[PDB]
Amino acid sequence: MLPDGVADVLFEDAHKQEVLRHQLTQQLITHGYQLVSPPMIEFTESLLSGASEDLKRQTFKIIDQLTGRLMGIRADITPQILRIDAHHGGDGIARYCYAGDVIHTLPSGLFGSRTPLQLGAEIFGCESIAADIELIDVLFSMINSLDMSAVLHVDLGHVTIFKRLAELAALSASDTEQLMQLYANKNLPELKQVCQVLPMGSDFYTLARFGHDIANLLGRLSENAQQDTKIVTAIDELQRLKAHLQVQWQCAVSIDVTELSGYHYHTGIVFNGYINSETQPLVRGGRFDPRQATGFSMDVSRLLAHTQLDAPFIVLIDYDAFNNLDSAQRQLLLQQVASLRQQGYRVTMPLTAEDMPVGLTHRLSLADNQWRLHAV
Amino acid sequence: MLPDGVADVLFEDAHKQEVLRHQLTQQLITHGYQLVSPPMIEFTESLLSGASEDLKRQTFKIIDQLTGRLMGIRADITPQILRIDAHHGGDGIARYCYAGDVIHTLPSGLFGSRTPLQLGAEIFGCESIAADIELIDVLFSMINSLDMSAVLHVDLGHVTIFKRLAELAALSASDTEQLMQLYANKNLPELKQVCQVLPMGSDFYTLARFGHDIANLLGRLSENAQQDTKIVTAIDELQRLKAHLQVQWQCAVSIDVTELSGYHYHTGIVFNGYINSETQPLVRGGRFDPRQATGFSMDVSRLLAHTQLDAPFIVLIDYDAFNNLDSAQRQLLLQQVASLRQQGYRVTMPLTAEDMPVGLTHRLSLADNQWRLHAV
Amino acid sequence: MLPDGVADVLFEDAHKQEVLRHQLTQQLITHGYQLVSPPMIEFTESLLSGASEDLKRQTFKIIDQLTGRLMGIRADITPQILRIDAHHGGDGIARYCYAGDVIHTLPSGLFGSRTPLQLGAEIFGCESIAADIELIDVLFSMINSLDMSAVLHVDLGHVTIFKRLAELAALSASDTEQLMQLYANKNLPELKQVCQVLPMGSDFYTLARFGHDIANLLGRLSENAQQDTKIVTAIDELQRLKAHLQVQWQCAVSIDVTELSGYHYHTGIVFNGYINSETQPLVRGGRFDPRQATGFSMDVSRLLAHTQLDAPFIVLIDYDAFNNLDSAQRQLLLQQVASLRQQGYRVTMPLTAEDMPVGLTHRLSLADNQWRLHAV
Amino acid sequence: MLPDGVADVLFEDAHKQEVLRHQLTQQLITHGYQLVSPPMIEFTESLLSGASEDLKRQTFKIIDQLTGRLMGIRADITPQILRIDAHHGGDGIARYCYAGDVIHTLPSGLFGSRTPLQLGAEIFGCESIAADIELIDVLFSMINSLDMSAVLHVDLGHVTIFKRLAELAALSASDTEQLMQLYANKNLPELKQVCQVLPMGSDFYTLARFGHDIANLLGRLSENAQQDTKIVTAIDELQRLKAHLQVQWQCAVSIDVTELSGYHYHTGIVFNGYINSETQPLVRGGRFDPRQATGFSMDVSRLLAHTQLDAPFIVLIDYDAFNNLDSAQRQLLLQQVASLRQQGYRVTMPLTAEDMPVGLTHRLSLADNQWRLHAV
Amino acid sequence: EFLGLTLALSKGRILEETMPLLRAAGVELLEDPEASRKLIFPTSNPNVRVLILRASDVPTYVEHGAADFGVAGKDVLLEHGANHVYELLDLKIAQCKLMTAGVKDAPLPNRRLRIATKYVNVARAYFASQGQQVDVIKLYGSMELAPLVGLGDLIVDVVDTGNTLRANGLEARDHICDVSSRLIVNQVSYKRKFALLEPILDSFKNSIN
Amino acid sequence: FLGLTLALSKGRILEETMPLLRAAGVELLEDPEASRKLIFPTSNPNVRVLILRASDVPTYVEHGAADFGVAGKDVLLEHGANHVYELLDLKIAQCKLMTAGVKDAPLPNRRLRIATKYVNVARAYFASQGQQVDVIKLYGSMELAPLVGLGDLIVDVVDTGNTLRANGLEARDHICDVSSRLIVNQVSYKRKFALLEPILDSFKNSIN
Numbered sequence A, B, C, D: 001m002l003p004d005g006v007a008d009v010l011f012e013d014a015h016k017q018e019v020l021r022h023q024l025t026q027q028l029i030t031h032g033y034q035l036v037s038p039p040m041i042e043f044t045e046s047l048l049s050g051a052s053e054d055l056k057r058q059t060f061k062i063i064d065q066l067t068g069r070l071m072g073i074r075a076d077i078t079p080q081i082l083r084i085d086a087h088h089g090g091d092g093i094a095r096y097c098y099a100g101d102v103i104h105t106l107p108s109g110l111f112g113s114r115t116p117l118q119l120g121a122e123i124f125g126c127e128s129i130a131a132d133i134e135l136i137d138v139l140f141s142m143i144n145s146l147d148m149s150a151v152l153h154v155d156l157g158h159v160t161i162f163k164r165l166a167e168l169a170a171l172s173a174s175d176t177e178q179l180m181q182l183y184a185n186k187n188l189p190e191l192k193q194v195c196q197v198l199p200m201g202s203d204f205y206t207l208a209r210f211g212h213d214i215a216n217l218l219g220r221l222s223e224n225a226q227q228d229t230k231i232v233t234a235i236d237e238l239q240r241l242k243a244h245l246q247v248q249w250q251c252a253v254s255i256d257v258t259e260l261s262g263y264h265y266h267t268g269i270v271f272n273g274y275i276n277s278e279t280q281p282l283v284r285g286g287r288f289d290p291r292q293a294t295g296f297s298m299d300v301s302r303l304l305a306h307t308q309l310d311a312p313f314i315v316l317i318d319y320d321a322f323n324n325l326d327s328a329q330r331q332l333l334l335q336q337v338a339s340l341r342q343q344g345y346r347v348t349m350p351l352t353a354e355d356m357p358v359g360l361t362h363r364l365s366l367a368d369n370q371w372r373l374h375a376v
Numbered sequence E: 001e002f003l004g005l006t007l008a009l010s011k012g013r014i015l016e017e018t019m020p021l022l023r024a025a026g027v028e029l030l031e032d033p034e035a036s037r038k039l040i041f042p043t044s045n046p047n048v049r050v051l052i053l054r055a056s057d058v059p060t061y062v063e064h065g066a067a068d069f070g071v072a073g074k075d076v077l078l079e080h081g082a083n084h085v086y087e088l089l090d091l092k093i094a095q096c097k098l099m100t101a102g103v104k105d106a107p108l109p110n111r112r113l114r115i116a117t118k119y120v121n122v123a124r125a126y127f128a129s130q131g132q133q134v135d136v137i138k139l140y141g142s143m144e145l146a147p148l149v150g151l152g153d154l155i156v157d158v159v160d161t162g163n164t165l166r167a168n169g170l171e172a173r174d175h176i177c178d179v180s181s182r183l184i185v186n187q188v189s190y191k192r193k194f195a196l197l198e199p200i201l202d203s204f205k206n207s208i209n
Numbered sequence F: 001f002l003g004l005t006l007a008l009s010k011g012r013i014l015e016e017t018m019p020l021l022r023a024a025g026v027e028l029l030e031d032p033e034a035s036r037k038l039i040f041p042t043s044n045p046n047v048r049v050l051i052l053r054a055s056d057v058p059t060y061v062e063h064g065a066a067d068f069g070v071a072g073k074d075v076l077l078e079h080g081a082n083h084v085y086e087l088l089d090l091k092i093a094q095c096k097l098m099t100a101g102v103k104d105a106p107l108p109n110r111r112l113r114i115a116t117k118y119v120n121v122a123r124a125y126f127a128s129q130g131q132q133v134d135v136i137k138l139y140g141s142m143e144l145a146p147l148v149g150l151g152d153l154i155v156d157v158v159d160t161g162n163t164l165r166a167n168g169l170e171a172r173d174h175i176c177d178v179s180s181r182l183i184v185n186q187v188s189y190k191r192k193f194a195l196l197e198p199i200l201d202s203f204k205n206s207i208n
C-alpha cells in the first residue's frame, strides 16, 4: 500500500491527465510562452530562495553525495523559473511556461495529494498591467477549452494598498501584524477599536469595511492616501483587471484588499481562482513588486474531477480468425489496424485465445471476407 | 548553480521532449498498453522490494511525517508497475505503459543525468516468447517513428544459461561472484586460469570466449550442459529473437550470454539497446518474475540529441497596427489569431513596441484592411 | 584498515593523551576558566556561522532525521563557545575552556590527522589588552608544565593596522586583494611598483619592508596614519604583548603585520605558536574586533610527539602462588594490591597461568612469607 | 537552538564529567586494562562488521573524499576494540578499556542523548566464567567509588538457552522472530497460544513464564532440553554469576532468559545494569565472539545526575590591592597563587574592578603585608 | 563518425614493442609520430587508425568509446580500476613489476608508514591485504626521489632492471604483482565491430604464442 | 644536507633556467638526461637540484622537500598552493592557458563537456563566465579529445598554436598568460634567507 495523500493515477485518469497536460502545454506554447522543464532536484540555495516557511516545510531535503550540500525535491516550480530567467531571460520581455510534478511533505488540504502536477505561466520584464491582462486571457482560454460544468470564481487583491497605508501611517511591525491578523479573522468590532488609536486609522477600517467596492474605494480614503501615487495605481489596476475579467470572459470577480498573505513575499496584485466551493484555490497568481515578473500556476490533477473525455474505443482482434490467415491477408489486416491506431483506437493483437484487454468495447472480427468492428 | 548531472531541459528541447514523450506514449496506448502514472514517492517496502544494491544506492530516502516510515524518491518505475499489476492485473495477460521522471543519487555514466525521464512498457501473465516478440515490435515501431539518423544496435543475453551451469557445477557464492566480475571485465586470461580449477570449468570459459556465436554455442558445451533442458531452450530463444530482429527489423544483433547484471532480478532473456557508440544502453529490458513478466524502459531525455522537429512558425502581431484597431476589428483579429494557433503557429500579442519573440519567422501585418503573414 | 589521516591512539600514547588532556584541563580550571563540553553535532546554522570557506569544507554534513535539517560534525569548537556565551555569558567578563575531538574531511597538513583533539580557552567581555596578557600567561604556564625539549616561537600580527590604512587610503576591494596577495608572496619589487600608484602607497610598502621592527613602525608611517587612533593602539598592543612575552616568559617573538588571513573574519590581534620547524602552528589565537572576545586553541595530539612520561610500572601477580593462599592471605594480598593501584601501578590478577600483560615490568611474587615486586 | 537529544554539558557538570571519566579510566588502567583511543570515524567495513540493523540505523554515514568509500561516525566503540584486538591482541588473554564520544541518529530513550560518552572494558581470549567474574568486580568497584545514593539493579540473561531450544525444536526464522517479539512484550496469553502449535512449545512458554526462577528452571524443562549439555552449562553460569553478585557485592539480581536483543551478537551471557527506575540500562555487557570475548560499556553522561563532587573553592584576588603592588611583590603573590592552584583552588586574576567569578567562595586580600584567604 | 577501428597506443615503449604485432596484423603506421605534432594517424589498413596518448589516458579513451581498443599496462589498468572494458589478451610486452622500495639498508620506522606513489589505489589495496596500515601521498613521477628527501618511507613503483632504484640509493622490498601490457577493448565496440576486430585479435593471438 | 635544494622539471624548464643558474654560479656538473639519477650536485656546494615532473614541483617545495623551485603558473593555478612564496616572474617557458574546440565547429546548445588536465582552472574559468560545465580529467595529448568526441572544448597551454592546428583545432577564449615563477618554501625563506638572497638577486638581474 501507498502513503496517505500519495496515489496512482490509473487507466482513464492517467490518459485524461496526459491529455490535459499536453493540450494545456500546447495552448501556452502557441500563445508565445517558452516551455521549460527544470529538474525535480536542485540545491536548496536556489530552490528555496525567498521561500515562505510554509514552502520550506513542504520541501523534502536530501544530501548531494558529490558535494555534501543540501538539495531538495521541489515543492514549487516558480523559484526555478526565476533562476532560469536570471541566466537566459535578458533585460527584455520573456514568457515562460512549465508543467511538472512537485512533492509536498504533508497534504496541502484534507485528503489532498502530496504529489500534485503543477502547471504555470510567467511573464518577466514588463511593468504594464497589459502583462497581467495577457496572462488572464491565456488562463481563461485554457480553462474554457476544457468544457467544464464547474465554474471558476476569481478573487483579486492588492497588497500594495495596505502596504502603502502602513508606511504612510508609520505603523510599527507590532501594529502591522495585529491589523493583518484582525483582517484575516474579519474582526470588524475589534478593528474599529484598534483603528481609533492608530495614525490614518479610518483608512485601515475602510479597507475592511468597503474594500469589496473597488469603484468607490479611492473616494472613501483620506486625502493623505488619495494623493499617494502607488495607492492610486493599485486601485486602478484592480479596476482594469476586474473590468477585463467581467467583459471579456464573463467572469464573476470579487475584490479583497485585506487579503494579505504574501505581504512579506513581495506580491503586488494577487489572484486566486476557486473551483465551485473548494477552499484551496485551483489557480494562484500575482505580481512581484530589479526585474518585473507576474504569473500563475494551477494543480492539473485537480482538473481531473471536473473534466471528461469521450470513452475510449478499445478493440480486440479475434485470435483464431487471425491465425487462419495467409501472409497476404495479415498484411492487409495490419494495414487496417495501423489505420485504426492512427485514429486513436486502442487495438490489441492477442498473444493467446484468452488475451483480453481491460474495458473491451469492440472486436475486430472476420465475416464475408471483411474485417469489421462489432461492439461486445 | 545546478548540481553535477542535473540540468534544465529548456525551450525547444523542452518542446521536443514534450512531443517525444506524448507521441511515444500514444503509440503504446494504441498498441493496447494501459497507461499508468504512479507517484514519485512510495514506502521503501514496495518501492525497493527485490531491489539490487545498485538500485537502493541510487534511491534517495525521506521520512513520511504521518507514519515515521521510510519512503523513497523513485529511481526506477518498474517496481511500481509490479505493485499495480498485483492489485489490478488479474491472472490473465496485462499490458502496462508509463512515462515519468526518476531520480538517481549518482550519475549513471560519463556526463550522465541524475534526473532522467523513464518511459517503458511491460507485459504480464504470458509464458510465451511471443510476448517478448511483441514488445520488440512495439519498441522498434516507436524508434522508427522518430526518424533518427543514429542507429540502435541490440545486445541479447540470457541469464538462464549461466544460472543453469552454476547449479549443475554446484558453484559456491564465492565462485559465482568471481566469475561474474571476470565476465564483466572479459578478463579471458584470468578466466582461463580460474576455470581449470572449477567443476564444468570449460563451459564457463566457453560462455566468455564463444558466447557471441549463438549458432554454435550448444555444440561447444559439455554433454552435461547439452542434455540440460533449460540451457537448450534458452539458446533456442536467443536464436528466435535474433532471427526476428534481423528479418523483421533489419537490425544487427550481437549476443552476450555473459551479460549478468540483473542476475538477481532477470529470470531469463535480457535486452540492451545502444545508440551509436554510447556506453550506457538507451534501452534496457528483459524477463522477470508466480507471475510471468517482461518489458523494457528507456531514457526519453537521451533521445533529444538524436531527434529533430520541423522548425516552429513563430508569429508576431504588429504592435502599432493592433493598438489603432477599434474593438470590433480586434475581435476579428483574435478570431484569426485563434485560427493560426489551432494550426500550431506560435503567435505573440506584443505588450510593447519592442516585444520581440526569440526566433521570429513571420509578422502578422495590416494592409488594405487585411491581416497577412509575411516572413522577416 | 583505517582511512588515511585517521589513526588509533594506542597504549602509552593513549595514556599520555589522557594525562595531557586532564592536566591541561585542570590548569585552565584553576586559572578561573569555566569548563564546557559542547556536543560533537549541531545544526550548521550555529556551527558554521561566520565560517571561512576552509572551515565549512573541513566540516562533514549529515541530516537530522527529526527535522530534515542540515547538521554537521564539528571541525572547530570555537563557534560553539560563541553560542554558549551568548546564552550563559551575560554582559560581564566570562572565561571558558574546552577540550574535545573535532573531525576534518581532509588532513590539514601532509600526513596529518583528520581527528585532532582541540583544546582552548577564551575570554569574553573585556576590551583591555589585559585579557590577552592573561591568556598568554595561562598558555605559557600550560606549555612549561609539559617539560618539553622542543621550543615554541610566537608570531604576532594585527590586521587592524592594514585594515585602517586601507580605509584611510580609500582602497577598492580590487586593490585590497592585490596587496594581500603580494604580502602573502613577499613580492617586494612588485609591491614597490603597485604602491607608487596607490593612495598612502608608501605606508603599504612600509608594512612589508619594516613591519618586523614594531618599536619604530609608527615613526616610519605617514602623518595621516600616525594621527589615526586605531593604528596607534594596534601598534601599542603588539609592543605590550611582545614585551610581556619576552620579559615574563623568555619567549622569542617575531612580528608580521602583513599576516592577513582572517582579514575578512573579524580578527584584531593574531597569535601563532610554532613548535620547532613545523609549518602548521601548534597554537592559534586572536581577538574578535557587540561583544568582546579573545582566545586560543591547540592540537593536543600534536603535543604527544614532544612530551614524555615516566615508563609505567606493569605488575603481574603470580598465578600459582595466589591460588595456594588461604582466604585470609588473599585479603592481605588484595589490600597490598589496592595500595599499589592507588600509587598508579598497573596490577593484573591473572585468570590463568598463561595470563600475561603487555609490557610486563614486575612480578608480585611470594618468598619468605612476603609478597614483593621483582623486575623481569 | 540545539537539535533534540543534543545538549551541552556545561560548567560544573563539565567538570564533574571530566573527573568521572578520568577516575573511572584510571581505575580500569590500574586493574590491568590497556587504554585505547580509537578514532571517531572509520570505514563502514570495520565499523559496522557484524552490526545489528539497530546499530547501522544509529550510525551516520559520510564519504571519504580520498577514496570515495563510505565511512561512518561511530555509534558504538566496541567494534573498534575487536579490530584493535585482531591486530595487536595475539592468541593469549588481552584486556582493553576505552572512553569516548559516540553519535546516534535517533535518541535511544525518552529524553535520551544522541551524543553519549561511552566508557567500557573488555577481556579477550578467555573461555572461563572467571573473565566475566573479573569484569563484574571491576565494574562494581568503579560504581562503588562514585559514592552514589542511587542503586544499580542487575538483570542477567543468557541467549544460549533460547538458542539451543530453537535448534532442538528445529524452529524456522518465522517462528524464532515471532517468539522474540512476544518475549520482548512478555505477551503471555498469546505466547501460550503460539506454543501449543510449536515443537517443544512448552519449553518456550516456560522460559517466559518461569525464567525469573533460575534455581528451578532446569527442572521445569522437557527431558530433551534437560539432557542438552549447552542448556545445562548456561543455567549453571547464571547461577554462579547471580551468587557472586549477591555474596561479593550484596546486589539484588534478577534473571531474564527471554532477554534476546543482541541475539545475533551475544554468544552467551548478557548483563544489563539499571539505575533506579530508568528504562534504558546504564550498563550493558555480555559474551561475544574463533576468539573469546566479553565486556561492558556505560554512558558516563548518565552518571552525572547521580554523582556529586565537593563544592569548588573559588578564589578572587583583590583588584585594587594587586595593582598597587611593585613588581617584586607581584612575583611573590603569583608564587602564592601558583601554590593555591596546585592545591586545586580556582584562582582568578581580575581584569577589572568588577571582574567577579561565578560562585565566589573566598577573596585573597592584603593586610599587614600578608595575602590571606577570607570567605565572603 | 569513423566506421572502422580506432586503436589507442602510448608513445615510446608501448608504440615500439607493438609495431611487430601490428605489422603481422597488416596495420603498420604510415609516418613516424615523433616527427610530427599530430596525435591521430592512418595505417596501411584503411579501416584502422591509431591514437597516440599518454599511457594513463589509454583506458579512459577505450572506456568511453573514443578508441575501440588499445594497449595499456596492467599497472595502469589496476590503478584506473576500469570494470568498463574487456581485457582480452596478455600481449607479454612492456614486462616489469609493481613493487615497494625504500632507502638502501634503512629500517622501517616503527609508526604509520608513509607511502609516496603514483599508484594510490594499488598501494592501499596492497598494504591492506598485508597486516599494514599506511598513509599515502599522491605523486605523478620521479618516485625514486621521494624517500631520499623525506617525502615517504617506501614507494610503490614499477621496476624492471632495478637501475633506477639503485641509481637513486633505493632497493626493492616487497613484490606486489607482475605487470605486462594487455589488449583492452571497448564493450560496445566488441559487440558492434566484432567482424573488424576478430581477424586483428587472432593475428595478435598468433604473434604472442 | 644543510644547503639549498632547488626543484626543476626535466625538459623545457631545466634548459631555459640553465642561463640564469650559470649567472648565479649554480651550473650543473652532469647532464641529467644521460642518467637515471633524480638528484644532482652543482658548482656551488650549497645548492643541489631535484629533477621532477612539472606537476610535482609545487608539492615538493610546499612540504619542504625542496627549499625553492621553478614551476609554471598554470601548474601553480591548478595546484592552488597558498603554502609557498611566489617571489619572481622569471619570464621563461612563456605560453598561455586557453580554450580550444574543433576548427569551425559550433558550440553544442547544452552543458559543455571540457576535456582537460587543468580541472580546477577549467571550472573556475567557466564559472567566472557565469556558466556551468562537465569535466573529464586527462593527463596529456589534449588536442585529440575533441576530434574523438571526448569533449566539446579543451583547456590547455598553447604557445605557437602548431599543436592545435596540427590536430584540427583552433583557440577560442584566453584564460590567462603563463610563465614560470620562482617559488620558495615559507620556512626556507625564513631559515635560509642568507643562502637565497644572493641567488634571487642574480635571477632578478638576469630577467631585467
Ligand SMILES: Nc1ncnc2c1ncn2[C@@H]1O[C@H](COP(=O)(O)OP(=O)(O)OP(=O)(O)O)[C@@H](O)[C@H]1O
Pocket (backbone or CB within 6 Å): E010, E011, E012, E013, E014, E054, E055, E056, E072, E073, E074, E075, E076, E093, E094, E095, E096, E158, E159, E160, E161, E179, E180, E181
Ligand atoms: N622499465 C620498464 N620496462 C618495461 N615496461 C615498463 C617499464 N616502465 C614502465 N613499463 C610499462 O610500460 C607502460 C608504458 O610505459 P611509459 O614509458 O609510457 O610510462 P611511464 O613513463 O612510466 O608513465 P607515463 O607514460 O604516464 O609518463 C607502463 O604503463 C608500464 O606498464
Ligand SMILES: Nc1ncnc2c1ncn2[C@@H]1O[C@H](COP(=O)(O)OP(=O)(O)OP(=O)(O)O)[C@@H](O)[C@H]1O
Pocket (backbone or CB within 6 Å): F009, F010, F011, F012, F013, F053, F054, F055, F071, F072, F073, F074, F075, F092, F093, F094, F095, F139, F140, F157, F158, F159, F160, F178, F179, F180
Ligand atoms: N609550448 C610551450 N611553450 C612554452 N612553455 C610551455 C609550453 N608547454 C608547456 N610550457 C610550460 O612549461 C611547463 C612544463 O612543461 P613540460 O613540458 O615540462 O610538461 P608538460 O608537457 O606540461 O607535462 P608533463 O609534466 O606531464 O610532461 C608548463 O607548466 C608550462 O608552464
Ligand SMILES: O=P(O)(O)OC[C@H]1O[C@H](OP(=O)(O)OP(=O)(O)O)[C@H](O)[C@@H]1O
Pocket (backbone or CB within 6 Å): E142, E158, E159, E160, E161, E162, E163, E164, E165, F036
Ligand atoms: O627498473 P628500471 O629498469 O630502471 O625501470 C623502472 C623505471 O622505468 C620507468 O621509467 P621510463 O623508462 O618510462 O622513463 P621515465 O621515468 O623517464 O618516463 C619507471 O618510471 C621507472 O622509473
Ligand SMILES: O=P(O)(O)OC[C@H]1O[C@H](OP(=O)(O)OP(=O)(O)O)[C@H](O)[C@@H]1O
Pocket (backbone or CB within 6 Å): F140, F141, F143, F156, F157, F158, F159, F160, F161, F162, F163, F164
Ligand atoms: O602551442 P604549441 O607551441 O604547439 O605548444 C603547446 C603544446 O606544448 C605543451 O607541452 P609540450 O611542449 O611538453 O608537449 P608534450 O606535452 O606533448 O611533450 C602541450 O602538451 C601542448 O600540446
Ligand SMILES: [Mg+2]
Pocket (backbone or CB within 6 Å): E012
Ligand atoms: Mg616514460
Ligand SMILES: [Mg+2]
Pocket (backbone or CB within 6 Å): F011
Ligand atoms: Mg612535455
